[PDB]
């Protein structure tokens, strides 16, 4: 049983995009950052819903000592697609990309075809000043761009209320190339013996202020208010009195009209598909189709096809192409001969009755 109340994310969720040192610079980056003031879903605990994973997820949680162990990612959470597990015990970590069966609670029941077992220092660092009031708050960021699972973290017993307002960067911990496919996310709980803050990252542009030792003192969102773009167009944090031309504005179009004088432009497709005396294969009637608009829905409704294979063009893409000429050779033939008729084939029909050239740009239609 858990709640789904709503809180304000404030200014939070800024990490180091790269591994390059800067000092007293105002570098501007474009990447997936959690936006500025916005709504995050605050959960409780006392069942463990499977939140979606897209373009990364920002995770935050405050706790006394430990109630949350790890995370599970991947698709279908079963023994059919590869998955993840980052469960953390009291001493080490258990990063592994495998094909666990399912647990419903000793967290997996299958490791048949999987590799990439990883172990390192524990992520959760907890310190107390001889008292439990130092509620350790942990902020984690995960993303899966071009594989290469990145994890960022920053551990500090902040004031202790909840999702705070003070700025705090995130230092990377691990970077391992799993890169399978991630669409879901779930969090494991304790076993036996006020958290769960979740935010979603979006592609934005940020201006980050650097200290002289290489830390990030502050940042400015580029799309929050009418301001915060003035500070970006002449990149700085102090703008003098005056008027600045920042960008331009444009209205978007709403509808689309396709008015035409006339557009039936009837093709003989009906006259070739509604015939009653389709000639034999030995004398295949060849009909020339020109000066008409080829709508393939009229071919779609007239015949319940059994073989609509196409070679030079896509069966889905036929109404978006213009053809100089179209030839429709029609002949009734046996069943196996339907599969016989194809470019680069052989047989009593492909050799003596009708031979399809290897460079054939068109489609064939067979209906019983």
């Amino acid at each position, epitope marked *: 049983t858990t709640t789904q109340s709503y809180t304000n994310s404030f200014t939070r969720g800024v990490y180091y995009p790269d591994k390059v040192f800067r000092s007293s610079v105002l570098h501007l980056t474009q990447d997936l950052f959690l936006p500025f003031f916005s709504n995050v879903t605050w959960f409780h605990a006392i069942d463990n819903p499977v939140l*979606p994973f897209n373009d990364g997820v920002y995770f935050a949680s405050t706790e006394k000592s430990n109630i949350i162990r790890g995370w599970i990612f991947g698709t279908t959470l079963d023994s059919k697609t590869q998955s993840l597990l980052i469960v953390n015990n009291a001493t080490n970590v258990f990063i592994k990309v495998c094909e666990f069966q399912f647990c419903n609670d000793g967290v997996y029941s299958s490791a048949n075809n999987c590799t990439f077992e990883y172990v390192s220092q524990p992520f959760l660092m907890d310190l107390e000043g001889k008292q439990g009031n130092f509620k350790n708050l942990r902020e984690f960021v995960f993303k899966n761009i071009d594989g290469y699972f990145k994890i960022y973290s920053k551990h500090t017993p902040i004031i202790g209320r909840d999702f705070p307002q003070g700025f705090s960067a995130l230092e990377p911990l691990v970077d391992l190339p799993i890169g399978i496919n991630i669409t879901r996310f779930q969090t494991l709980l304790a076993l036996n013996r006020a958290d769960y803050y979740v935010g979603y990252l979006q592609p934005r542009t940020f201006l980050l202020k650097y200290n002289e030792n290489g830390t990030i003192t502050d940042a400015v969102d580029c799309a929050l208010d009418p301001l915060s773009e003035t500070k970006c167009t002449l990149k700085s944090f102090t703008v003098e009195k005056g008027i600045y031309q920042t960008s331009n504005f444009r209205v978007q179009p709403t509808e689309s009209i396709v008015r035409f004088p006339n557009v039936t432009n009837l093709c003989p497709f009906h006259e070739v598909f509604n015939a009653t005396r389709f000639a034999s294969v030995y004398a295949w009637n060849r009909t020339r189709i020109s000066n008409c608009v080829a709508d393939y829905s009229v071919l779609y409704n007239f015949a319940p096809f059994f073989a609509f294979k196409c070679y030079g063009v896509s069966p889905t893409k036929l109404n978006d192409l213009c053809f100089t000429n179209v030839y429709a050779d029609s002949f009734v033939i046996k069943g196996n001969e339907v599969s016989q008729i194809a470019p680069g084939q052989t047989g009593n029909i492909a050799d003596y009755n009708y031979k399809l050239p290897d460079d054939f740009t068109g489609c064939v239609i067979a209906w019983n």
Partner: antibody
Amino acid sequence: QVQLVESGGGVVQPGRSLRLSCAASGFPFIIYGMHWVRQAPGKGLEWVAVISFDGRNTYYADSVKGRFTISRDNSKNTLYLQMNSLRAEDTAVYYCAKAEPYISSFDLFDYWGQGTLVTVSS
Amino acid sequence: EIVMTQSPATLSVSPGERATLSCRASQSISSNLAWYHQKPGQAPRLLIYGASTRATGIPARFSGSGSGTEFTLTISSLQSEDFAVYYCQQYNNWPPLTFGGGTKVEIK
């Protein structure tokens, strides 16, 4: 409990416009995509439109492409569907369906609304 | 576009026995298919996702099997709330979304 209630349907003349709404409550609406699905009488279900969790990604069915507009408002937990140039075949009942990520971005319609009827006639 | 054909257009069985439904795909979809329950006048309910996995809160009497293009849906014991229209939906080809014709299950 999750509730999806549709509204705004009714009778309309050919060539006019109508706007539908689907209010959402009881779940974290801002982190899921939604779907509009219509069912003509005597026919099966037909997929119409889709909008992502923020709004940048939208897709349309080939039968309604260029005429139907889908949008959402996260601040009010409502979903909209603007319709323009309504023809005869657009008479059906429209359902707003929650999406649950599976294999791809959104493939399962988990909760369905009660739906509203739209009919077009002279 | 992958077209989705319902082998049984309409099925008639008395309560108690087993009903078998079949849905076919034009191209290979692996095990990506879903079933929906739909009583006259109500909103669709999800039954089976992944062609082999039962949805939450659904009795075990529902089961399905099959992969590729041939799929089956099996109900061991039909009950008073099972006579409805069943739809099979593909989601392997994500860009478009297709549905089956639907099977009507009715009391004999």
